Each structure stands twice: as structure tokens, then as C-alpha cells.
Amino acid sequence: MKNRKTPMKEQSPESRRRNFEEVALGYTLEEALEEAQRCLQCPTHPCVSGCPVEIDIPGFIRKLRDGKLEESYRILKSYNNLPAVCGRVCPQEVQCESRCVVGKMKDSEPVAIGRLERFVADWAAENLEEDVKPLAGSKKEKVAVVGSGPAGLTAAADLAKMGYHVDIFEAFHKPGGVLVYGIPEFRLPKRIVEREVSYIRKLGVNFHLNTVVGKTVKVKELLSEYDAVFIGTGAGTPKFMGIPGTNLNGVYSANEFLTRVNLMKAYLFPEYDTPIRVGKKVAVIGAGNTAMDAARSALRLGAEKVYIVYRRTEREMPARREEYHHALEEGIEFLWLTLPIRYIGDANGNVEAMECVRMELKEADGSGRPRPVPIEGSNFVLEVDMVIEAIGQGPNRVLLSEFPGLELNERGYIKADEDTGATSVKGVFAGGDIVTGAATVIKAMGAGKKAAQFIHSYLTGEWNPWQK
Amino acid sequence: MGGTALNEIVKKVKIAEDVFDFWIHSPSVSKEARPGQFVVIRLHEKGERIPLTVADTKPEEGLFRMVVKVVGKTTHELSLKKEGDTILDVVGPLGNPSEIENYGNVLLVGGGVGIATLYPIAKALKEAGNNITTVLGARTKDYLIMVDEFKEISDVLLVTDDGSAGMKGVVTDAMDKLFRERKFDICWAVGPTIMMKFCTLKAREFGVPIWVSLNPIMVDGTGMCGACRVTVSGQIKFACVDGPEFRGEEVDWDELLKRLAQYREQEKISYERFLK
Ligand SMILES: Cc1cc2nc3c(=O)[nH]c(=O)nc-3n(C[C@H](O)[C@H](O)[C@H](O)COP(=O)(O)OP(=O)(O)OC[C@H]3O[C@@H](n4cnc5c(N)ncnc54)[C@H](O)[C@@H]3O)c2cc1C
Ligand SMILES: Cc1cc2nc3c(=O)[nH]c(=O)nc-3n(C[C@H](O)[C@H](O)[C@H](O)COP(=O)(O)OP(=O)(O)OC[C@H]3O[C@@H](n4cnc5c(N)ncnc54)[C@H](O)[C@@H]3O)c2cc1C
Ligand code: SF4
Ligand code: SF4
Ligand code: FES
Numbered sequence: 196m197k198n199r200k201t202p203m204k205e206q207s208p209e210s211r212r213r214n215f216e217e218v219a220l221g222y223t224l225e226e227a228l229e230e231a232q233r234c235l236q237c238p239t240h241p242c243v244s245g246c247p248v249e250i251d252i253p254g255f256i257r258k259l260r261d262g263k264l265e266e267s268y269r270i271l272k273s274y275n276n277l278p279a280v281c282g283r284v285c286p287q288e289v290q291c292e293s294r295c296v297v298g299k300m301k302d303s304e305p306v307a308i309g310r311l312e313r314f315v316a317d318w319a320a321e322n323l324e325e326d327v328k329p330l331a332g333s334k335k336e337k338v339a340v341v342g343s344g345p346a347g348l349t350a351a352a353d354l355a356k357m358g359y360h361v362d363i364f365e366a367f368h369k370p371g372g373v374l375v376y377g378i379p380e381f382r383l384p385k386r387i388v389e390r391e392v393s394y395i396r397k398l399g400v401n402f403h404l405n406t407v408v409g410k411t412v413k414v415k416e417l418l419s420e421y422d423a424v425f426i427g428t429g430a431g432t433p434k435f436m437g438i439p440g441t442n443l444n445g446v447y448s449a450n451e452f453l454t455r456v457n458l459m460k461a462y463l464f465p466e467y468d469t470p471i472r473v474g475k476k477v478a479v480i481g482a483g484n485t486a487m488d489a490a491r492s493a494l495r496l497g498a499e500k501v502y503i504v505y506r507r508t509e510r511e512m513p514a515r516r517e518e519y520h521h522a523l524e525e526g527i528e529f530l531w532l533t534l535p536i537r538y539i540g541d542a543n544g545n546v547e548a549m550e551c552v553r554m555e556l557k558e559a560d561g562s563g564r565p566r567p568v569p570i571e572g573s574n575f576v577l578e579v580d581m582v583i584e585a586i587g588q589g590p591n592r593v594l595l596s597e598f599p600g601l602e603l604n605e606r607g608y609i610k611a612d613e614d615t616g617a618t619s620v621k622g623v624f625a626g627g628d629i630v631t632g633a634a635t636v637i638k639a640m641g642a643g644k645k646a647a648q649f650i651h652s653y654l655t656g657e658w659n660p661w662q663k
Numbered sequence: 664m665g666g667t668a669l670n671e672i673v674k675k676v677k678i679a680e681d682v683f684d685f686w687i688h689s690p691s692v693s694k695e696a697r698p699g700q701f702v703v704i705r706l707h708e709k710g711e712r713i714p715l716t717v718a719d720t721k722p723e724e725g726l727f728r729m730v731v732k733v734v735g736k737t738t739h740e741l742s743l744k745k746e747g748d749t750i751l752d753v754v755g756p757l758g759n760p761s762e763i764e765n766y767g768n769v770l771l772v773g774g775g776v777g778i779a780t781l782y783p784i785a786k787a788l789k790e791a792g793n794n795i796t797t798v799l800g801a802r803t804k805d806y807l808i809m810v811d812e813f814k815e816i817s818d819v820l821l822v823t824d825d826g827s828a829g830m831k832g833v834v835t836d837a838m839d840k841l842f843r844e845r846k847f848d849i850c851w852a853v854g855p856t857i858m859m860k861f862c863t864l865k866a867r868e869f870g871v872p873i874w875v876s877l878n879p880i881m882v883d884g885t886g887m888c889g890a891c892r893v894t895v896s897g898q899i900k901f902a903c904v905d906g907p908e909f910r911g912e913e914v915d916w917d918e919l920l921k922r923l924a925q926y927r928e929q930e931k932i933s934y935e936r937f938l939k
Contacts, residue, residue: 366885367883404752410755410756411755411756432887437899442892448888448890450887450888451890454887459711465935467709468736468932
């Protein structure tokens, strides 16, 4: 009666609980080919409607079936700049695979499009490469890309292919944005990010690392010396709930936790010089992927119990299903409809507890997800030696203020044309999380590709959005 | 090729038992830096990002000055870095610039290395038209001394150390010993948190407004994490973005050093380093 996805090799739960190695190990060729056979090749291909950049899914599946693997990769790459990333991190359960027909069947799972995108992208990685020849510097004109996330990498790459001088500006010592300091190694191996950056390096894109724009170099210089500019800085500014005890030792922003853990590799100590605080009972506040990574990371650091604390339920939770399952398999505990009210510490220095309540289904939506209303008398406590806040984060409003005439939305994100990415300032484009608020990698990728195309349309004089 | 390099250590000179005055090439930091700002650095690929203050600049030659006290692996390692060795990563200038302009008479105080992070501000006041007086303190009687040369040039000098050229107890005893003068306008206190705090508490003697440069645990130094949290007046502030300079009256001081003792490891990294 059932029709399931072809199972993939995964790390053993007991062994993988302690390490940061990738958990989903990837398809073998035969497993991939066996999965590719489940695709029914629907002429109307609803799957494609669930992909934000509209990848020709049955096509690359077809050429995979046929054994023409490069052709498959070529089909993928004409749409997605970062397939090995997206096939790994896309929440296909709310995207491409949620429209898949084979899942419409009773007791039947959809085609594993993501695992296949991954397989094809990975298979081509440890096998072939391309021509090392740089393409940048043919169109003589200068475009600056600020931020080296999916958006900036994508725009830069695509622009270098278009012949332009591409100079990337990055604040950190490593490029990749969230792909380097946010999402952990056990989800996204960094060999892939380094690979893609290197690829983009060989295109003649020059990276300015450890470069914080507005400080290292003034916005005015960037505007004066460059024909166009793309802003892909994301929404990385942390916010704290602001309840009492936010200032206790053991209390962290997920930004800081994950920055120490992922970028500074504080789990590798004293090999790497960055330390990380001990906690056996840690609380991670949030139910995003941020919370899940922070929790799953804290667990790997040798914590005994790890709690997810969420003001909403399992069916509102914005986390990737595969990773939530992994999280459960690794022993993460979940508190549905739970909201902290204060953190409590001891004589010397410590978090020792957290006061929480239970919520109600009353209020309808009203931003967020349906506004939970606190219930009285349900008030309780969780004993914790470490707290991590994964409640989300907002845009670098400061850097934005340094752009004159650059219009922001109600929440402070940039206003830019949905299709072209052009903003109110002349010659300045923008895309990724800095515009939409926190979304997906694929959307930052897409935003960068379109912005690049309209940078091309702009620097050739075909299309000009800025007049009096 | 007969030239310099990016993060090359152009000069390294010792000035105390554990303090080192570096001059380092970095045209961006040299050109862009204003007083009260700082840089975050990493020495090698396994390195940690650490905060240090830009204590001077020579934009013409593209140099910036840096003063380091050896407390753990990283500062030690940089102090062991020979002239010509490069620092892998240098990020700056960081932080909010100091508030400089032509004011009345000004008093400043600096302890330990904070003095070097106190100098650049002090230097800017004077070229702004101020008349300054300075109080310098040390961490012990004999060894661990203070910068002899630089301050005396800027103004009349006051010393506080178990030893030479001045009083003995504390910098706050040197303050309040202006009971005679009492002075007016503004103040500045930079050094260990405790010192700056009590300098604030010496808003009691002269009813004086005290500026302060804070020193919390930093990672990014760009405002993306909030390790460097600070409570000002009542509201959370990031010392790397909103600071490091604040008004001592507003700063939660116990909270800070209660948070500076957050990683009582590096006990470890320092030991592992200190093997031959
Ligand atoms: C923990 C976490 C988990 C996530 N998990 C998923 C997932 O599973 N699936 C999915 O689809 N999406 C996920 N996302 C979202 C996705 O990673 C982001 O949407 C994506 O990284 C945004 O791309 P971006 O280039 O627009 O911005 P970012 O990647 O956020 O930032 C890119 C670059 O901007 C640089 N920058 C910022 N300011 C400056 C400056 N002044 N000067 C120079 N450089 C600057 C930064 O240094 C950074 O490198 C996750 C995000 C986080 C934080
Ligand atoms: C704005 C600002 C300006 C500063 N300017 C200077 C300066 O000019 N000269 C100077 O010598 N120091 C300065 N510091 C402090 C300097 O960052 C610390 O001494 C340094 O972080 C520790 O180096 P480490 O080799 O001991 O590294 P680690 O091995 O990580 O630290 C070991 C010891 O350093 C202690 N420590 C105290 N503060 C910090 C901190 N922010 N980060 C990490 N550890 C800390 C820790 O308690 C720990 O025990 C400044 C700090 C700030 C926030
Ligand atoms: S829907 Fe499922 S089956 Fe029909 S094409 Fe897309 S993947 Fe193949
Ligand atoms: S990109 Fe994300 S959505 Fe589009 S196909 Fe690959 S996985 Fe499904
Ligand atoms: S140090 Fe991370 S925000 Fe200031």
C-alpha cells in the first residue's frame, strides 16, 4: 500500500551525537538512479511550481536516469548557482517536493528531488572541474558586491561571467555568510563553500575579506569608484527578548554561539584558540533552524540534556523537517507553547534557571504566527546552566542609514523591485535576506542572479530605472 | 621585492615586563582610524579574534600603533611575533569614535594598558585646543611600569605607584587631591573595569562627568553577536557598535566584570602555549 523515498545512508545516532561530521551522507549512484525512477515524468510537472527559481526538475532527473550526469548538472546549474547547498538545506517539504504527484498517492512519499540535486552536484564535484580561465574584466566597468553570502557570491559569479570587474567586500575572514558561520558542518560541509568560492575566485572576482564597508572603506568611496553596487549583507543583527537575566553568564545570542562554534570552531579547542562555555542542561529559545542548529551543536559539545523552548506548537514550527527528525533522534527535547519570563543566576556567575508559562490559541495571527496568549497558573521553571536565543534577527540599519535616499520598509528592510532588485538609489541593487527578511538560501541566490542580470541590463544602457 | 607587506609588524619594542608596543602596516586602519576606535585581530588560522585599541596612526607611511599586555596565548603569541612576521587577519578601525572638541580644562586617568588606549583620545583633545592634566597608575611596586615619555609632552604629569615620581595608593587618591584645583568640565577613565568604576564613583568629590572606555569579551566586534553586551543607563548596548566609550554614571559596572570572568578557561590555552 505504501510507496516510500529510497532511504539514504546516515550516520549512526549514538556515534553522530558527539561529532560535527555531515549527518546525511548522500546517495550512491545506484540509489540515486533507483530514486530517479520514481519520477513519473509529469507533463505539467507541478514539482517545478514549488521551486522558487523553477528548476527543470524532471529534466535533470531524466538525464540522470539516462546516465548523462554532466548534462544533468548542466541542467541544474543553469537555474541554481548553489545546488549542493540547496539540495542539502532547502525545506523541500514546503517547496518542490510538496507539489510532487507521487506524494498525492495514499500512504506515499514524494520524489526525493533534493537528495538528487545534491547527488548530481556532489558527484560532479569529486569528479570533474571546468576551464580555469578568468572571465572578469572584459566589460571594463566596475561593480562592487558587499557581502559574500549566497546573494553576493551568486551575483559576483554571474557578473564575472558577464565580463565585469567584480570586487567583493566581506566583513569576516571567511566568505559564505550564513553558509560559513551560521549553518554547522553536520548540515553543510564547508568543503563545498570553499569549492564554490574558489570557483568564483578563478572567474577573476577579487574578494576583500575582513573588510567592513563603512569602516574599512567608506560608502562614499564605494559609490564614487564603482559603476554599480550590490548589497547582500543579510539580516545578521541580533536582538534579545530583554527579559530579566538576559545579562547572566551562560546567556548567548545564537549569532554568538553559532559564530564561536561554526566559524571559530570552539568545539575544536585548544586546537583553535576560541573557548566556549560549559552547560549540561542548555536551553535554546526558538524553533527555527537557528535554534535547531544551536541546540544540536550544544548537544555535540557534550551536554547531557538539551531543550527546545517554543511559544508555539509543532505544526507552527518553521524548522526543516528532516533536521527536526534528526534532532529528535539525537535526543533534543521540545517544550511546545513555552515562553521564558526571566533567567536566574547564582552567587558567583551562572545561569541556573528559567521561568516559563504556557500559551493559548486565542489571538488570530497578528504578525508572527497566531499570537499565543499566556495562560495563568501554568507558570513553571526550567533549570539551566546555559541559554541561547534563536528568536530571529534584523537588518544592519546603521550601514543602511549611510546610504542617502535609500528607502526602508516598516521593519527596516530595503525596498527594492521584486523582479529587478533595483532600489531607490541610482546604480545600487540589493538582494537576499537584507531585503526580504530571513528567508531561504535559494531566494538569496535567485535575487542575486536577477540583480546581476539587471546590472547587466543597466551597465549596457538597455534599461534604466533611475530618472528625475 | 624590497618592500613591506599587508599586516607586517614594522616595529616591536618592549616597554614593560609584559607589555609590547607594536607599530604595524595597514593603510586602511592607518587612514580610516579616529580616536576611541579599535581593531580586532587574528594571528593565525587557528587563531581567535581579539580586540585591541589603535593608539596612534601614521597614515603617510600607513602605520598604526598597538600596545599589548600578555595575559594569555594570543597576546603572548603576538608579543613573540618577530619584526617582519605578519598578522593573518586585521579588522578595523572598529567602534564609535570619541567625542572631541575645544572644551575647558580636562583631566584624564589611565591604568595598565588602558593608558595606551587613553593616549589617542588625549592627543586629540590637545589638537582640539584643550589644556589637560593626567594621572597614571600601575599594577605593582617595582616591575610592571608605565609609559615614561608620551604623556608628559601633552601636559603636566601626575604619578601614582608604590615607588617613584608620585603618590602610592590609587588613581582615585590622585583625584580628590585636586580638591585644591577641583578643575571643571569633563573627565576620562580607562583601565581595568574596577578602576574606571571607582573613577566614576569619584563623580562624588568634584561632581564631575566621567567618560569611560569599556573592555568586554569580543568575538566579531562588528555587532553581529552581542558577546560584548553592556547595560547603559538602563538599556542594552553593544560596546563594539555603540561604544566602547560611555558615560561612567550610566554604565553597569558590576555586571561587566561579572561577565569578563565568563571564560575562566584560557587558563588552558595559555598553559599549552607556554611550553618551549
Ligand atoms: C542558523 C541559520 C540557519 C539557516 N538554515 C537555513 C536552511 O536550512 N535552509 C534555507 O534555505 N535557509 C537557511 N537559512 C537562511 C539562509 O542561510 C540565508 O537566507 C542566506 O544566507 C542569506 O544570504 P545573504 O547573502 O542575502 O545574506 P547573509 O548570508 O546572511 O550574509 C552574507 C554576508 O554579508 C556580509 N556582510 C554584512 N555586512 C557587511 C559589511 N558592512 N561589509 C562587508 N560584508 C558584510 C557578511 O559578512 C556575510 O558574509 C539559515 C540562516 C541562519 C542564520
Ligand atoms: C575595546 C577593547 C579594547 C582593548 N584594547 C587592549 C589593548 O590595547 N592592549 C591589551 O593588551 N588588551 C586590550 N584589550 C583586551 C584584550 O582583548 C584582551 O587582553 C585579550 O582579549 C586577551 O588576549 P589573550 O591572549 O589572553 O586571549 P585569550 O586566550 O582568549 O584570553 C585569556 C584571558 O584573557 C581574559 N580576558 C579579559 N578580557 C578578554 C577579552 N575581551 N577577550 C578575551 N579574553 C579576555 C580572559 O578572562 C582570559 O582569562 C581590549 C579589549 C576591548 C574590549
Ligand atoms: S511531480 Fe514528482 S513525479 Fe511529476 S515530475 Fe515533479 S517529481 Fe517527477
Ligand atoms: S532548489 Fe530547493 S526547491 Fe528548487 S528544487 Fe532544488 S531543492 Fe527543490
Ligand atoms: S562583539 Fe559580537 S556584537 Fe560586539
